[PDB]
Structure formats: structure tokens, C-alpha cells
Design a protein around this nucleic acid. Structure first.
Ligand SMILES: [Zn+2]
Lengths: 652, 155, 84, 49, 93, 51, 214
RNA sequence: UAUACAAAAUUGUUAAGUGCUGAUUUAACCAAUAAAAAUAUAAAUAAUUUUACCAUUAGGUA
């Protein structure tokens, strides 16, 4: 419905423009909420006062003649705009012209009345906490406008998102206390505007409080807008904050409603807003797919809505970025459109898009249920290197997931042989399990697959792990040994299973029996059959129909031992009894294949919210304890430095 | 025990005290916490007291012990609620339970020579012994005292 | 597959047993590990004389050679005094 | 550059060359290409004659 | 560091600037007189809840008998009232 | 920006005034001008004599 | 003391001696143990000890308790030992253990260059987060400066010895310009690149693997 | 004139108390923080930042 809303808003805006032109000719069908701000900025920077204030230092000829005249012997004071510097390397580490110390908040306190709070927040050293900042501003009694209030709240929000997950509540309480102070401070004149409310919504989104953010601050902003006509107009920033909150809280219906409201209010959306809309549609599609797997907007309808969002992206002439490509790929993966995923990748690579590693994650995940793409996967992996990117464990896991789904095996073997071994990274249990599943379910497996599986298992055991996939990993390894005929390897993996302490499984014993059956050449005989068949009685493990089939195959492969015949009779009787008790014979269920999206693949990285600019600019006031007189002292230089000094040895 | 809390409250009516305790318990459960034990020590005679809600300097209060297993983020909220409750005259929080007090001050050898699991698994009563209890009682626990405590009034 | 061994500690294969510390002394631990690797089946122990790892490292002086024994790898980590 | 690390760098270069020869080896002879001309010669510039 | 009504631990300067004069029980006694003593949590009361508290709370009307949900900031700063009272006033006049 | 530019220009004017060297003492300025408050204030409007 | 704390945090029973009685247990027998009637009948030999060599392999529960040990225990005890009840130290160890699992060479590997880099970065993050709420801690400011310098050294060494992991870390954690020259005056004299030569990291690239040396 | 070589810690937290606007003094638990790149010959391995009431001030009246 978003495309219909867009065209309806465009035609209504055109009709209103024509009506007002007649009352009072091409005009945009929408309204830009940032054009007036950029125009004001351009006028400000082109104003003569700004150009005169921010001017280059006077040359020696401009200052005067030669030197020695006080006042005209050095260039006068030079002021620089940090956001748009007219010089390079604003700061310097000379001896007599150090200006880094002159950039802390104490020096700007003097001109706090004319101060731009956003500029102060972005460019200052040893700033106090935002609460103390607001307290100092109120103590100085300056008329804080909406921009200043929003800048203070944005500084608080930066602190919130910098802090850890389990340390957000105190910062959010500080933010709400600051909001209350701003509301109740009548003097000096302090206004809480749409931008400030949007920043509070952003704080609520960063903390993770949908109930505290959507029903409180957005509601307050809407009430202010309806109470005061045109004095509290909602910009694109407020709705961007609303969409951020919806994405953070998982709300999809509210996000769609907010985007539809933006479209209807006859103002153009933002690229970030459209990316958030695509993310919400992807979440809805994933939920629908989960519901269908368990087995309510129609899947075709949600696919059409995603397509019309992508169309609106160019309808409003909004440039697409890497985040846009990632969101569209995620939405298409949720809607199962690998052709559109590939088309989007081609379009991104066409004009100018720096494809991130997540884009290739989605590319590999999109074709998981499609055959005849192993060469495409290999070419993607090869092309990763020229793009400045390197494959990681997540991408290798996705590739091996594709290999296991397509049960090709040769592709997984080639990938491991020519991409992974060069990485020298620790494999993950999911990666190893997927590799072994592909190498076992493939057709015509080879001994090199067994060697690679053993190498991967050894490396996984040598490295650490937190998850526990040991039982399925060894079960698939035993199935591979069954398909290959490696009875010795299958029997030796039992020692590893015992060392891990995991109990044996009827599926594992069936794999051992199948290995004995199809290892006529290498080794195996009636003695091996008896030794394997003595497990069900001794280990009290229930037999199975696959067990009966495997033991009959082993019987036909080697001969007729009386113990084997008695076991066959008793297992036939037990299977008949189980069929009488139930309706269908039991069977060894296959191990499920992981098909989870890459965004929930157990990322092995929490968060690093570090800033190289702050580290180099020594924000927060780092200290190094420099050396003292040791470097400065050089001794007496009356004579030359000779060995053993001037007076070698002395007696007191 | 993760956290202990001793609440000194004004001896209001039974319904009001029950409502306050119910609110505390509901807050603890809603913040993803667990209550090991909640006990009422009755109304005692403190040496000095001064109410905050009623501003009456009178010596009459009730003591309550509350054992909790909650994370720091939610324990902050619970502590704020307890301290801001009008009925709670004075709340003291014992967080020095999983680690013995002043091992660092005691000795460097004892700084890393303690096992937190024993203190964590034991209740607050075993961590801080009451005057009436004794290791004699503790040893009587495993001595089959039922079959022996039969002639305790033979004289 | 190549792992660069940067520094003399990594070239000499320090265990770095101490958690998150690379500049910690390790000679005592290595000496005790070699003592464990020693065998108490005829099992002749090794004398306390300072030894060399290679037979070619024995001193050319015949008298001095009596004070040195050829120990394969237990000759390393010799000495009682630590760095002053 | 510091000259005290020359011996260590020589040792590392020798080890790297030995590892290269041991592992990569030489996969067949390569036909020698005829060398071209170098623009960068020493001395003053020469006349176009 | 002082405690508001010996309850709310806050810093001295911020308390003297903002916290102390912005309490509902202190700044607006008439508004605080309508506080609901049963539906509201026992840890929330006008002696510690400020004027700008945006989270809605329960109000018991004084003119009529009606318990409603309104935020303190809306009731004090922006101006709020009893929905039943305002609808009855609309019906009458 | 207007006020900041004015302050910067005043700082530059102080730097230029530094060329003049140390300032002379009060009596030079005091004897420089024999002007009175009467001539100072008659420029705007003539105030009536006190009654 | 700091090394003892780190060793206890990384390993399971280093503080327990052969006699199985710590010094604190020697001096305070009552505070160390209590009397419990129920015998440890369910608790036999741990047949799953092969998969938990160090504490970093079990950062899912409090006190690094393996999941298998909580079998005959109530869901209340499971929730009490769940992730939400972990302390700040436990959560920081969980983060560093995740990074060690990602970039470890073996089970007891805590001194890999990548592990050192990530630990320095985490320490810098913790110190900066502390200074965010306590901007008047001079000792913490100095410690943060020292930790940042150490992180820079670790990152340069990791970049020179193993570029794959360094690039992966940079891309994952979005610190692209974490290694940048401070001053143009010194940079244009080649003192930022002379660090690689002075640190013994000049010739270490394996040119054949990444390019053509011809 | 030239030369003679003339971590018992910090920040925060909390409790009491004096003051009576800033202020304001002590004590305690808890939280965070101690080591971790190459080399001693390596000729600059090193940063450019941080920190009650009066009388006279200890005398009276209350
Ligand atoms: Zn009413």
C-alpha cells in the first residue's frame, strides 16, 4: 500500500501547489525537511562576517616589514571552524604553539553565552557529565533553545550507547531527569522541541524501552504538535527516531504505520528510514516463515510491500548505500527471492557501492535451497580478496551450510582445500558439523574427505568451544565412515566418544554395521559383526529397522554366524511386537541441517565502541607521566667525552 | 547468598505491612529475581530511631530479613524502590556475602585463597551466625538427635 | 599456515603459562617440568653437573670435560641464582 | 633505519628464504624474457643524437 | 548529599537547584491533594515524585468520584483535568 | 558570530596597541582635556538647571 | 596478587592445594564449610571433564559451572545460576573468553597476539566507560593512557605478524583508523614507519602468498 | 686578547552530623582500577596530555 500512498500523496501535493499558485511552474511532489537547514548553513558560511572571522593568517608582508616591531612581528589570532576548517591539522604538538589544552570545556565556559552546544559536544576535551553540563548552563542562565536541548540529550544518548548493555538503566534515568529539568526550568528560557523529543525517543531505543519510549515521549510530542499548530511540526528526524525505536523493539506494524504517516504527510522520507522499513519487513517475513514451518498478512502481499518500498527508494531519488543493500538483501532472503538478491548485488556493484561482508553473507544464505551454484560460491570467495574483504567463520559456516543442503561434498572439499586452510582460524562446531554432513551425504565420497573430517575434528578438539555438538558431529563422522568403508576409523571414534563421555546411539551402531557390510575389501568379518552386535544386549540399546537392514547386509556380505542369526530372529520378533504396539516401524531419524539466518549465527564479538579520533585527540584527559631531568641533563661539556670519564675512579 | 537486605520499618497495621511486603516481592519477581528467604523478626526496641514519613523520633520498629539473587542492573531498581518506600525507615544492604569481608586487608595470601561457592550456597544465617545458634546445634543436626533426645526431661 | 615467531621468547618457545602475562619468569617451571620428564627397567638418572645439549659443545679441555655431562634437553634451565 | 638489527634481519631473511625453497620449491623452468631498456641511467643527461 | 524527605538520596547542589522546589507535594499542594493512595505504587508518592514525571499515574478526583490515568507533567505543566469533570462541564454548558 | 567577530577584532586591536609600548600615567590624560560634564552632556540635549 | 587473581579467573582449581584445604579454610573452618545431611550420591566421576579444561570454555553459568553439573537440580537453582545473575567480573570474563575462543591457538592459550589485542581493547573500553560516569579520576586517566599505548603496540605487532586476524578484527569492530600517525611533522620524516623496523617486524610478509615477488 | 679542559590509593556510592543556599566534616561495605610488543644495546626503544549570637578568626554571651 506504500506505493499507492506515495502516488496519492504526490498527486495531492501537486493539486495543492497548483491551487495555491492559482490563488496567489514545476514543483517537487514532496517536501524536503533538510533543504532549508542546508540553505541556512550555506548562507551562514557565505555571510561576510563568517568569512572575515575565519580567514587565513596574515603573511609577513601583510603584517609589516621584516621584524622587531611589537604587535606587528607575528600573525594575529586565527580562528578555525572545526566542522569546516579552512586549514589542515588544526592541532599541533610544537613547543610554543600547543593548542590542544586550549580546547577543553573550561575555556568555552567564558563564551558559553554564544556557544553552540552541538559544536561543544562534538569538539571539546574533559567535558563533564551531561547532567553537570546542563546544570552549568542553567547556572550561567543562558536561553537554551531546542537545538541546545537536543544536543545535550544527544550527548547523553552517545553516553548511553557507549555504555554496556547492563549499564543502560542509570544513564536512561539521568536522561529522564535532564528532560524533567528542561521541562520545569522556566528561567532561563528553555524550550523542549520536536528534535529534543526525537532524541529522547532515540535514548529509549538505545536503552531498549519500547513501553517507556513509544507511549510516553512520542505521545508527548504528538500532543504538543496538536496543541500548538505549526509550532511543533514533526520533522523527518522525529520519524527516523520512531523507526529506530520500532526496529530496536521489533515492532513492525508501528514502524509501517509511521512510514505510511511520513508518506501521507507529503514529505520525502530518508534513506535510513527506508532501510529501517526494509529491516522491519524482513523481520515480518522471517516471523511468517517461522509460523509456516510451525504449520496474518499474506506472504505475497508482504513481498509486494517490500518490492514497493525498494521502488520508493528511487521514487524519492534517495541514493542507496551499503546499509540499504544489506537491508534489501535481508528482506529478499526473508521472502525467498535469490534472483532478486543476485540482481541487487549486481546493481550495487554497477555504479558505486562498497559491498560489506554482510552483503556476501546474505548472498550465500539466499541460495541455500538452490542447486548448481557451487561455482558461484567459489567465484564469490575468490572475488572477496580483490575487494579488500576477507572471509570469516560466519561466511564459511554459511558456505558449508549450502554444501550440506546440496549434499555435493566436492564443493565443500574444494572450499576447505583452497580457502579455509590459508585462513588458519579456529573452526566452529557448527562449521565442522556442516562440513562433515556435506562430505557424508554427498555421492561417491573419497578418503580425502575422511582425512579432512579427521583433521577438522582434531583441530576443533585442540581449540576451545562452548556449544556442544559432539554427538551429532561424531554421528555424521560415523555415517561417513559407513559410506566409505572405514571400519577402523568408525571403531576408533568410539574411544573419542567414550573420552567425551557421551552415550552411544543406535544410529551410530547402525552406521558401524553398514561400514562392516560395505568394507568387504579393506577389513571386517563375522567377528566384527559379532563384536558390533554385542552392543545392543550389553548396552541395553533399542534395535531398529535400519539395524535389521544393516545386520542383514552384513550377513549377506560375510556369512551366517549362529549368534548373528539368533539376533536377527530376536530383532524380527521385537520389531513385529513394536509394530503391533504402534502403527509404523521405527527408523533412524536424520540429523537436521542448520538453516538459521546469518544474523543469529552466534557472533563471537560483543561490542567495541571505541573512537580513534578521541584517542588521538586525548579526550577525557589522558596522562603519560613524562620523564623529568633525566633526558634534559647532559653533564658538563667543558671537555670531550673520553672513556672512563675525566676522573676514572675516586676515593672518599 | 547474592544479596541480603535488613529492613527497619514503622510498625504499621498488618494489612499495610503485608501490602508493602507484597509490593517488594512483586517488584523482585518482575525484575527477574529470586527470593531465597523472607523472614519477620518482629517488633523490637532499637536504641535510636527517627521516622522519615511521620518525622516522629520514637523508638519502635520492626525488622525484616530478605535474601535475594538478582543482577546489579535490577538490584539497583529494587534498592531504589526499597529506599524510596515510605514505610521503609532504614534499609541496609549486605553485598559482602559471596566474598569474605576484608580478606585483602587481612593478608595477601588470603586474597585469592577463598572459594565463593560455599558462601553463595549457604544461607545468610550460616554466613552470619545468630547469638542463640551454635556449632553444637550444627553437629546435633547430623547426630540423629531424634533417637537421642528422649531423656532430655528424665530428671 | 606459517606462524611468525616474533621475539626471543617465542623463538625459544616459552609456554606463557601465566595468564595474560608474557614477561613472567618461566625458568623454574621449565626446570621442574624437565625434572618430571626425567625417568626414575634400567633407568640411570642424570647427575647435577652442568650439562650441554650437544656432544660437540663439550669443552676442549679434557679436565674441564669431566665437569660437564651430555644431557639431551635437560641441560637447559640450569642454575639456582636468579636475575639480581 | 637502525643498524643494530641487521644481524637479526639477516637471520630472519635466511629462514624465510629457506622456508620458501623447502615448501614452494620451483614448479618447472620459466623461459627467459629479453630484457628491455631502462630510462634511469647515471650521470648528466645525454643528447638526443 | 542529602535525602529528599529522608527518602531520595541526591547530590546537594542538584537538590538545591531542581529537586527540592519541583516536588508535587511542595510546589502544587492542590494538585497533590488529588493523589490516589491505593492504585498508585507504595513507592511512588507526591513527596518524591517531581512535577515533570511523564509516566502516567492514577489520580482520584476531588470534585467528583473518578479514578483516571494522567501524567504529572501533563497535569501540572501543560494543564490537565478530570475527563469526567470536563465532559460534565461540556454537557452542562 | 557577529559578537565573536567583534571580540576577535578587539583582540587584534589590542595586539596592535601593543606597538605603542607601555602606556603613560594618569596625569597626562588628565591634563590633556579641560572638558567638563556640561560640554559633554550638552551634545545630546540641554538639561535644565537644578531647582 | 594481580597474577593470582588472573590465574584463578582463568583456571579451575589452582587455588586448591594437594591437601584440598585452602589457607582461608585452614584459618576459618566454619566459614569455609557447613554440614549437609544429603550425601553426594548422584555426584560421581565427571565423565564430561574433557570439554572443560579452563574457565573460558564455560561462560554460560555463574562461577563457570558446566551445564552437565546442573542435572538433578531445580529450575530455581538453574535460574539463580543463569546468565542474568552473573556479576560484572563474570560478564567481562565471558566477553574475553568469547574472544579467546575465537582467536585461541590451544586450550590454554591466553597470550596470542590477537588475544592480547582484544584484551587491551576491552580494557580500554572498560576504562573509557568508567571515565564516562566518573570524569574526575586522574589515576584512571593515566591507566587509560597506558592501556591505549599498549593496545597500539599490540595492534601494530598483530598487523605485522598476522594481517588476516588484524583485518578481521578491524572490520568487525569498525575501528578502521585505530592505527593512525599522530603528527604530520613526525610522519613526513618516516618515524611512524621506522617503528616497524625498530621493532623487528620489518621483513615479515610471506610475499609469495599475497603477491608476486618477481 | 687567544690558550693552559676553573590498591591502608583514587572516583563514585551510602550513613550520621554541624551549618542554614553555594556549603559542609568523618566512617563503612560494595563497584572500577596493580602484571601483560619487540631490543639492552637499540645511540634519540620516550610523550607533547593531566591535577547559635557578639566580639576577632578562637574569646566571650547564649
Ligand atoms: Zn472529576
Amino acid at each position: 500500500r506504500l506505493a499507492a500512498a506515495a502516488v496519492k500523496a504526490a498527486e495531492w501535493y501537486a493539486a495543492e501547489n497548483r491551487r495555491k499558485q492559482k490563488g496567489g511552474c514545476t514543483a517537487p511532489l514532496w517536501f524536503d525537511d533538510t533543504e532549508q537547514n542546508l540553505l541556512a548553513r550555506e548562507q551562514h558560511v557565505r555571510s561576510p562576517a563568517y568569512r572575515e572571522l575565519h580567514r587565513p593568517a596574515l603573511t609577513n608582508a601583510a603584517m609589516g616589514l621584516y621584524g622587531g616591531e611589537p604587535g606587528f612581528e607575528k600573525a594575529h589570532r586565527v580562528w578555525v571552524d572545526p566542522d569546516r576548517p579552512h586549514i589542515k591539522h588544526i592541532y599541533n604538538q610544537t613547543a610554543l604553539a600547543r593548542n590542544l589544552r586550549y580546547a577543553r570545556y573550561g575555556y568555552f565556559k567564558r563564551d558559553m553565552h554564544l556557544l553552540d552546544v552541538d559544536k561543544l559536544v562534538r569538539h571539546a576535551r574533559l567535558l563533564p557529565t551531561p547532567g553537570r553540563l546542563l546544570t552549568d548552563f542553567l547556572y550561567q542562565r543562558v536561553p537554551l533553545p531546542d537545538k541546545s536541548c537536543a544536543a545535550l540529550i544527544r550527548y547523553q544518548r552517545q553516553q548511553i550507547e557507549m555504555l554496556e548493555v547492563w549499564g543502560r538503566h542509570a544513564s536512561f534515568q539521568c536522561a529522564v531527569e535532564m528532560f524533567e529539568r528542561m521541562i520545569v526550568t522556566n528561567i532561563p528560557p528553555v524550550e523542549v522541541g520536536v528534535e529534543t523529543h526525537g532524541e529522547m525517543v532515540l535514548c529509549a531505543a538505545a536503552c531498549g524501552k519500547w513501553e517507556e519510549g513509544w507511549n510516553v515521549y512520542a505521545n508527548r510530542a504528538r500532543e504538543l504538535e496538536k496543541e500548538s499548530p505549526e509550532s511543533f511540526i514533526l520533522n523527518t528526524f522525529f520519524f527516523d527516531a520512531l523507526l529506530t525505536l520500532c526496529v530496536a523493539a521489533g515492532r513492525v506494524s508501528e514502524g509501517i504505520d509511521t512510514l505510511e504517516e511520513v508518506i501521507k504527510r507529503n514529505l520525502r522520507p530518508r534513506g535510513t528510514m527506508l532501510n529501517k522499513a526494509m529491516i522491519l519487513y524482513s523481520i515480518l517475513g522471517e516471523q511468517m516463515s517461522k509460523h509456516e514451518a510451525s504449520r496474518l498478512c499474506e506472504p505475497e502481499e508482504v513481498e509486494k510491500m517490500g518490492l514497493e518500498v525498494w521502488s520508493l527508494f528511487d521514487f524519492y531519488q534517495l541514493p542507496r548505500t551499503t546499509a540499504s543493500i544489506e537491508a534489501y538483501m535481508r528482506m529478499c532472503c526473508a521472502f525467498n527471492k535469490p534472483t532478486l538478491v543476485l540482481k541487487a548485488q549486481g546493481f550495487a556493484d554497477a555504479s558505486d557501492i562498497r559491498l560489506s561482508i554482510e552483503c556476501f553473507h546474505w548472498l550465500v544464505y539466499a541460495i541455500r535451497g538452490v542447486a548448481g551454484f557451487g561455482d558461484y560460491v567459489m567465484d564469490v570467495l575468490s572475488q572477496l580478496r580483490p575487494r579488500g574483504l576477507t572471509p570469516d567463520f560466519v561466511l564459511f559456516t554459511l558456505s558449508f551450510m549450502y554444501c550440506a543442503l546440496q549434499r555435493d561434498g566436492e564443493l565443500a572439499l574444494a572450499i576447505f582445500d583452497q580457502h579455509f586452510v590459508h585462513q588458519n582460524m579456529n573452526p566452529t562446531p557448527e562449521m565442522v558439523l556442516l562440513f562433515i554432513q556435506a562430505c557424508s551425504n554427498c555421492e561417491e565420497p573419497t578418503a580425502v574427505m575422511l582425512e579432512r573430517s579427521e583433521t577438522l575434528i582434531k583441530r576443533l578438539e585442540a581449540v576451545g568451544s562452548s556449544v556442544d555438538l559432539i554427538s551429532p558431529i561424531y554421528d555424521q563422522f560415523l555415517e561417513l565412515c559407513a559410506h566409505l568403508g572405514a571400519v577402523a576409523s568408525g571403531f576408533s571414534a568410539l574411544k573419542r566418544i567414550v573420552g567425551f563421555g557421551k552415550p552411544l546411539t543406535t544410529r551410530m551402531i547402525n552406521s558401524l554395521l553398514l561400514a562392516n557390510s560395505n568394507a568387504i575389501s579393506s577389513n571386517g568379518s563375522l567377528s566384527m559383526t559379532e563384536e558390533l552386535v554385542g552392543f545392543f544386549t550389553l548396552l541395553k540399546i533399542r534395535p531398529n529397522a535400519d539395524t535389521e537392514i544393516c545386520v542383514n547386509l552384513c550377513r549377506d556380505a560375510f556369512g551366517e554366524s549362529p549368534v548373528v542369526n539368533d539376533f536377527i530372529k530376536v530383532i524380527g520378533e521385537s520389531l513385529q511386537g513394536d509394530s503391533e504396539k504402534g502403527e509404523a516401524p521405527q527408523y533412524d531419524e536424520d540429523i537436521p541441517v542448520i538453516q538459521v539466518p546469518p544474523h543469529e549465527l552466534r557472533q563471537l564479538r560483543t561490542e567495541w565502541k571505541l573512537s580513534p579520533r578521541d584517542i588521538v585527540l586525548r579526550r577525557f584527559g589522558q596522562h603519560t607521566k613524562p620523564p623529568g631531568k633525566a633526558a634534559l641533563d647532559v653533564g658538563s661539556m667543558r671537555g670531550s667525552v673520553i672513556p672512563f670519564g675525566r676522573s676514572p675512579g675516586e676515593q672518599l | 547468598v547474592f544479596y541480603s537486605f535488613v529492613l527497619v520499618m514503622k510498625p504499621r497495621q498488618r494489612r499495610f505491612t503485608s501490602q508493602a511486603l507484597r509490593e517488594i516481592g512483586v517488584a523482585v519477581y518482575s525484575n527477574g529475581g529470586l527470593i531465597r528467604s523472607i523472614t519477620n523478626e518482629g517488633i523490637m526496641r532499637p536504641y535510636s530511631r527517627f521516622r522519615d514519613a511521620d518525622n516522629t523520633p520514637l523508638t519502635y520498629a520492626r525488622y525484616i530479613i530478605l535474601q535475594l539473587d538478582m543482577g546489579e542492573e535490577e538490584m539497583g531498581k529494587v534498592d531504589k524502590i526499597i529506599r524510596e518506600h515510605q514505610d521503609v525507615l532504614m534499609a541496609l544492604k549486605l553485598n559482602n556475602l559471596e566474598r569474605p569481608v576484608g580478606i585483602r586487608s587481612g593478608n595477601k595470601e588470603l586474597q585469592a585463597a577463598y572459594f565463593p561457592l560455599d558462601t553463595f550456597t549457604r544461607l545468610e544465617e550460616e554466613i552470619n551466625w545468630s547469638p542463640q545458634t551454635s556449632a553444637d546445634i550444627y553437629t546435633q543436626l547430623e547426630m540423629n538427635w531424634k533417637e537421642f533426645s528422649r531423656t532430655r526431661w528424665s530428671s | 599456515g606459517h606462524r611468525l615467531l616474533h621475539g626471543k621468547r617465542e623463538r625459544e618457545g616459552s609456554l606463557f603459562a601465566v595468564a595474560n602475562d608474557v614477561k613472567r619468569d618461566e625458568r623454574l617451571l621449565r626446570q621442574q617440568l624437565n625434572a618430571l620428564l626425567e625417568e626414575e627397567v634400567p633407568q640411570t638418572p642424570l647427575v647435577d653437573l652442568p650439562g650441554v645439549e650437544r656432544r660437540r659443545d663439550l669443552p676442549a679441555d679434557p679436565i674441564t670435560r669431566l665437569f660437564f655431562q651430555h644431557k639431551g634437553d635437560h641441560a637447559l634451565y640450569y642454575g639456582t641464582y636468579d636475575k639480581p | 633505519l637502525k643498524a643494530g638489527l641487521l644481524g637479526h634481519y639477516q637471520q630472519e631473511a635466511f629462514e624465510a628464504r629457506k622456508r620458501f625453497e623447502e615448501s614452494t620449491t620451483y614448479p618447472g623452468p620459466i623461459r627467459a624474457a629479453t630484457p628491455g631498456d631502462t630510462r634511469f641511467y647515471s650521470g648528466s643527461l645525454e643528447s638526443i643524437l | 548529599h542529602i535525602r529528599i524527605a529522608n527518602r531520595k538520596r541526591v547530590e546537594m547542589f542538584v537538590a538545591k537547584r531542581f529537586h527540592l522546589p519541583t516536588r508535587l507535594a511542595t510546589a502544587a499542594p492542590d494538585i497533590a491533594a488529588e493523589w490516589h493512595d491505593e492504585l498508585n505504587p507504595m513507592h511512588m508518592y507526591p513527596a518524591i515524585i517531581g512535577i515533570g514525571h511523564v509516566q502516567p499515574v492514577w489520580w482520584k478526583c476531588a470534585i467528583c468520584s473518578h479514578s483516571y490515568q494522567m501524567s504529572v507533567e501533563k497535569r501540572v505543566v501543560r494543564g490537565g483535568g478530570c475527563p469526567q469533570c470536563v465532559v460534565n462541564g461540556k454537557r452542562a454548558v | 558570530t557577529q559578537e565573536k567577530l567583534a571580540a576577535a577584532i578587539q583582540e587584534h586591536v589590542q595586539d596592535a596597541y601593543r606597538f605603542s609600548g607601555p602606556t603613560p600615567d594618569q596625569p597626562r590624560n588628565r591634563l590633556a582635556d579641560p572638558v567638563t560634564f556640561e560640554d559633554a552632556n550638552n551634545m545630546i540635549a540641554p538639561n535644565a538647571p537644578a531647582a | 596478587p594481580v597474577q593470582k587473581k588472573r590465574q584463578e579467573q582463568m583456571l579451575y582449581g589452582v587455588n586448591i592445594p594437594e591437601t584440598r584445604q585452602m589457607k582461608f579454610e585452614e584459618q576459618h573452618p566454619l566459614l569455609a564449610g557447613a554440614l549437609r545431611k544429603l550425601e553426594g550420591q548422584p555426584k560421581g566421576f565427571p565423565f564430561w571433564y574433557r570439554k572443560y579444561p579452563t574457565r573460558r570454555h564455560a561462560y554460560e553459568y555463574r562461577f563457570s559451572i558446566p551445564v552437565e553439573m546442573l542435572d538433578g537440580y531445580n529450575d530455581d537453582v538453574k535460574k539463580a545460576l543463569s546468565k542474568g545473575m552473573m556479576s560484572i567480573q563474570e560478564k567481562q570474563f565471558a566477553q574475553e573468553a568469547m574472544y579467546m575462543e575465537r582467536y585461541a591457538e590451544h586450550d590454554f592459550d591466553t597470550t596470542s597476539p590477537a588475544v592480547l589485542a582484544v584484551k587491551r581493547a576491552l580494557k580500554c573500553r572498560v576504562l573509557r566507560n568508567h571515565l564516562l560516569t566518573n570524569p574526575h579520576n586522574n589515576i584512571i586517566k593515566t591507566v587509560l593512557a597506558n592501556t591505549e599505548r599498549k593496545l597500539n603496540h599490540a595492534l601494530r605487532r598483530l598487523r605485522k605478524v598476522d594481517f588476516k586476524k588484524y583485518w578481521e578484527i578491524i572490520r568487525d569492530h569498525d575501528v578502521q583508523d585505530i592505527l593512525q600517525p599522530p603528527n604530520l611533522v613526525t610522519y613526513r620524516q618516516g618515524s611512524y614507519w621506522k617503528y616497524d623496523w625498530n621493532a623487528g617486524l620489518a621483513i615479515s610478509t610471506n610475499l609469495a602468498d599475497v603477491m608476486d615477488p618477481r
